[PDB]
Amino acid sequence: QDVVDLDFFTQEPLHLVSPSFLSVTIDANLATDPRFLILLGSPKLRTLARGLSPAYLRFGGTKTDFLIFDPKKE
Amino acid sequence: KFKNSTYSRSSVDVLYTFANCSGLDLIFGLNALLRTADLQWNSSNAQLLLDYCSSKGYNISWELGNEPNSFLKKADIFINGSQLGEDFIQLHKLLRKSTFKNAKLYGPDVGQPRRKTAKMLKSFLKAGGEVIDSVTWHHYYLNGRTATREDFLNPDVLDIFISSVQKVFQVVESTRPGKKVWLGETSSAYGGGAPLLSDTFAAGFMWLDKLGLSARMGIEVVMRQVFFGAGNYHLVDENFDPLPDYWLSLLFKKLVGTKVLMASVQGSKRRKLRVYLHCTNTDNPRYKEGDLTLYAINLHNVTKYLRLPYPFSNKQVDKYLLRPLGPHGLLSKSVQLNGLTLKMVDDQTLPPLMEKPLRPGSSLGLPAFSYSFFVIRNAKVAACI
Ligand SMILES: *[C@@H]1[C@H](O)[C@@H](O)[C@H](O[C@H]2O[C@H](COS(=O)(=O)O)[C@@H](O)[C@H](O)[C@H]2NC(C)=O)[C@@H](C(=O)O)[C@H]1O
Ligand SMILES: *[C@@H]1O[C@H](CO[C@@H]2O[C@@H](C)[C@@H](O)[C@@H](O)[C@@H]2O)[C@@H](O)[C@H](O)[C@H]1NC(C)=O
Ligand SMILES: *[C@@H]1O[C@H](CO)[C@@H](O)[C@H](O)[C@H]1NC(C)=O
Ligand SMILES: *[C@@H]1O[C@H](CO)[C@@H](O)[C@H](O)[C@H]1NC(C)=O
Ligand SMILES: *[C@@H]1O[C@H](CO)[C@@H](O)[C@H](O)[C@H]1NC(C)=O
């Protein structure tokens, strides 16, 4: 008949997730795109990012281990 | 085949400004393949970055290395978990001597727990587990190159995540009991996602199931690969337009609270109808302390009708049902909420996410190959304070 009965456990919280439970990445490799400044400066993209606040933003990826900080580079 | 690249103060500022202006907490992965003669981590490059970030007053959290289990494949360098643990202890000492001495440190961002990865994670947590704020590991269901549409809809594929999570907790409970466990990079499919699948409505079965199971099983934070970038598992495409998983993510954020409860379907068949239950997000101005949020996935090829148990059977329920906009069905990149296409109002303005109130005491209709949230109003659940 396609009807299904649900059972609920509501006595106490079984776990507590972070308010930032649903978080996001930006891949380390995006910093090798010549347009990195243009992309992350996009007002449209920032509006969508603000929509998922609060969240962690992990800057990381395979390229994490192939990136070197050069304080002289422009 | 991977080559060193450099990045500038400019690139750091672009990244930081994007996080700060978007209300996100930046975690920056440091290069773990910078090594001394005796294969110790050489922290001198990290020192330069910590000093620059300090000088700009940047509030940043840290990681060191990405999938160190595959360093031999990627760079012909083998770092064992013991040494990596020692490397993290050295980073922790640098952070403690920095302007942000209470900065958080996460790692080691291992892949899913195959035997060799489980061993590296265990030896890493024995050596280094004292200095990390959370244990990070990664998960993908499929290879993007070979994934099929049927795979994206297969409960036997979804169920494999349960065994990965159990294996990670077995390692952590043996070494650092009670340490928080995070998914540090996760998606439907690796290699940038499954073409024509990872960017569609059909991606949402895996994403919502992962969130449900992660919350239910004790994972505290799930980091989606990727917000934006190369690979069709992105939430936002090359035109800065949101894909169905962005809308699903936003709805999840608006409705689902931090306190995790449990739902299950009466009867021996629990594969294709998947149910999750939390307290309602208290920040949602429509709802009140004690309200419940149920979310459900229907992988059956017919509509199912859910009946709520006593004492919730006659409560006002708000439906938030996601279905694809045609003509491409589950392979659509457009989604409707309760029959209204979800689209930006403009570049600065997200749309309202409009509920559909159901008749009190009606069963909850869930169409074939769909997912929905249901808020149970005036549920008055004491556990939800
Ligand atoms: C997690 C890794 O940390 C992550 O970097 C990786 O995604 C990136 O790397 C993928 C492999 O590229 S390559 O063949 O080794 O050159 C690449 O296919 C993705 O496009 C890239 N993603 C981004 C957003 O830049 C993922 C993955 O998808 O494989 C995980 O391995
Ligand atoms: C539809 O799915 C069938 C298997 O699922 C079961 O049968 C259907 C009618 C529903 O009752 C569902 O709840 C059951 O679990 C397949 O055997 C059948 O081939 C499918 N039909 C088509 C044409 O795809
Ligand atoms: C990256 O640079 C470091 C030190 O500057 C070096 O040890 C390493 O061999 C380089 N890796 C590649 C792949 O060129
Ligand atoms: C670490 O790296 C820097 C720059 O590449 C190098 O000059 C320094 O001497 C290294 N330290 C050790 C102990 O190898
Ligand atoms: C791990 O690596 C170091 C060298 O980097 C070595 O001295 C040590 O014995 C190794 N540990 C194990 C358990 O093999």
Ligand SMILES: [Cl-]
């Ligand atoms: Cl190891």
